[PDB]
Amino acid sequence: EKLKDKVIEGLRNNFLVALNAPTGSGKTLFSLLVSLEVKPKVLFVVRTHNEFYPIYRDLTKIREITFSFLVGKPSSCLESENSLYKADVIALTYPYFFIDRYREFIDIDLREYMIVIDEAHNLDKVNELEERSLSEITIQMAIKQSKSEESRRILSKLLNQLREVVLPDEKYIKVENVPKLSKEELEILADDYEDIRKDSLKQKIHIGSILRFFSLLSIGSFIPFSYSKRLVIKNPEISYYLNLLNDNELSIILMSGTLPPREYMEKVWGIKRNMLYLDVEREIQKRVSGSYECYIGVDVTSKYDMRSDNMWKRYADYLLKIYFQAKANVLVVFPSYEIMDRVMSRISLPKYVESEDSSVEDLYSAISANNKVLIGSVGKGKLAEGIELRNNDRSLISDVVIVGIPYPPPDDYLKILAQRVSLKMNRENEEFLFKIPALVTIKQAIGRAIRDVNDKCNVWLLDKRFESLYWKKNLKCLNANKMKL
Numbered sequence: 001e002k003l004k005d006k007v008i009e010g011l012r013n014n015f016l017v018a019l020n021a022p023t024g025s026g027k028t029l030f031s032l033l034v035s036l037e038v039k040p041k042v043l044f045v046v047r048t049h050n051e052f053y054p055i056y057r058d059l060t061k062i063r064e065i066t067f068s069f070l071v072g073k074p075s076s077c078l079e080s081e082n083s084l085y086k087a088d089v090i091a092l093t094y095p096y097f098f099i100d101r102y103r104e105f106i107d108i109d110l111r112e113y114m115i116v117i118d119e120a121h122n123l124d125k126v127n128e129l130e131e132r133s134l135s136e137i138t139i140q141m142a143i144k145q146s147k148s149e150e151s152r153r154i155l156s157k158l159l160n161q162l163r164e165v166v167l168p169d170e171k172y173i174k175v176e177n178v179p180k181l182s183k184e185e186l187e188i189l190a191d192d193y194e195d196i197r198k199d200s201l202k203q204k205i206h207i208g209s210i211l212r213f214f215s216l217l218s219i220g221s222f223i224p225f226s227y228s229k230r231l232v233i234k235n236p237e238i239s240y241y242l243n244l245l246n247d248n249e250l251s252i253i254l255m256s257g258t259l260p261p262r263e264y265m266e267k268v269w270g271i272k273r274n275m276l277y278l279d280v281e282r283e284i285q286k287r288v289s290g291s292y293e294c295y296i297g298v299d300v301t302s303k304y305d306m307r308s309d310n311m312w313k314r315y316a317d318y319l320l321k322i323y324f325q326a327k328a329n330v331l332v333v334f335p336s337y338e339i340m341d342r343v344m345s346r347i348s349l350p351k352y353v354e355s356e357d358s359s360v361e362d363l364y365s366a367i368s369a370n371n372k373v374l375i376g377s378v379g380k381g382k383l384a385e386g387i388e389l390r391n392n393d394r395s396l397i398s399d400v401v402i403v404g405i406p407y408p409p410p411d412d413y414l415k416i417l418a419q420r421v422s423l424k425m426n427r428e429n430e431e432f433l434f435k436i437p438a439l440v441t442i443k444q445a446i447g448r449a450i451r452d453v454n455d456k457c458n459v460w461l462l463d464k465r466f467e468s469l470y471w472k473k474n475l476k477c478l479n480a481n482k483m484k485l
Helices: 001-011 025-035 050-060 138-144 151-163 185-192 190-200 209-220 262-268 309-324 337-344 360-363 412-419 432-445 469-474
Strands: 016-020 041-047 090-093 115-120 133-134 223-227 230-234 252-255 275-279 293-297 329-334 351-353 375-379 397-403 457-462 480-483
Touching: 001 016, 001 025, 001 275, 016 041, 016 375, 025 041, 025 050, 025 115, 041 050, 041 309, 090 115, 115 329, 133 138, 133 190, 133 209, 138 151, 151 185, 209 230, 209 432, 223 412, 262 432, 309 329, 309 337, 309 397, 309 457, 329 337, 329 469, 337 351, 360 432, 397 432, 397 480, 412 432
Parallel strands: 016 252, 016 275, 041 090, 041 115, 115 252, 293 457, 293 480, 329 375, 329 397, 351 375, 397 457
Antiparallel strands: 133 230, 223 230
């Protein structure tokens, strides 16, 4: 609209551009038009292979434009471990742009391109891409599949090592004592990937994934953490994955439905160059998303001090109670898979607890005319992106439930994040460290409910803590009806 200039000006003017555009607001198309007015080629960096369609579509509808899709390396082999360069507009997935070792994979300049990163509220969980991990489970299938002999010797010694360094706790516990493997021991194992990468192929070999795990560990930046019975090397440094956005030689546009506050991007994401932060709401001075009713539970909370079995009983009743009264499916959001269980293991209703796999079909295979379904999902990626809710033209979900507060746990991974940011974990950063991230999850969820300007739905904030005026303000909903039972 008016933006189309304030932006094209900024891009050419070399400022980094952020756009806070609500769900189904026309977003995608905008950058399309505006990019082909700032630079020749246009690059699209998206969450998953799904987002690729709103491209081709909004792309095919352009006057004066050859597209070049790109599906993962694994889903093509005629675990990623050609006629592209001839495209005016290409589309990639997070990795092919953020993984140093995945960019060179795709020989690209980027300069000739207008870079558009979609749903950039994920730049935090971008470290997630590279994390590798060991689970007693692999250390096993890795032994059954063992053409070599003395590879199972080290393969069980490790299984032992592992066990000594992992707790079920659903939080990142820093690990010192990390199973050790001498280069020679690697050999025995590397040559076992051989006899395997032969006889078996003479017709996924996860004995190398173990290797990838130690290979990556070799670097040095990554840190080992025990997260739910699995070892996990993960690089806490964020501004080590997003520093690419500072290169003043790159025109960039960051957009999402719930982009984080300017300072967050500064203090957390480590984004230094000049920035033009434009938000649709404060612009056309109107709400573009879809309205929703606010009901705040105040006889419940997920906080440690008050949580118990009686507590989980309550919640199960809320779900039960919010289920029927609903006009359609219900999407419930838990802070951890643990809680999602004690509350869900109560409900004798038609549920679907996404977890680990939960295939594409799986989900709609769960809402397969089964009428209302109480869908469980924990606020940590997995279930999200591309998965709209649009079928015969009706947001399949009428109610979005938030059980407790999806604040991030103050664990070791969180503590190494605050120190790599010289952002003292005190009071001043409560927001950036916990609140803000917690605010994205919820909103990223109320979003999967609405997709139009009219499209309405209920939002249940089940946790006394939500009646504070802060939450009421930040989750576009002051006029909120309180309630018990």
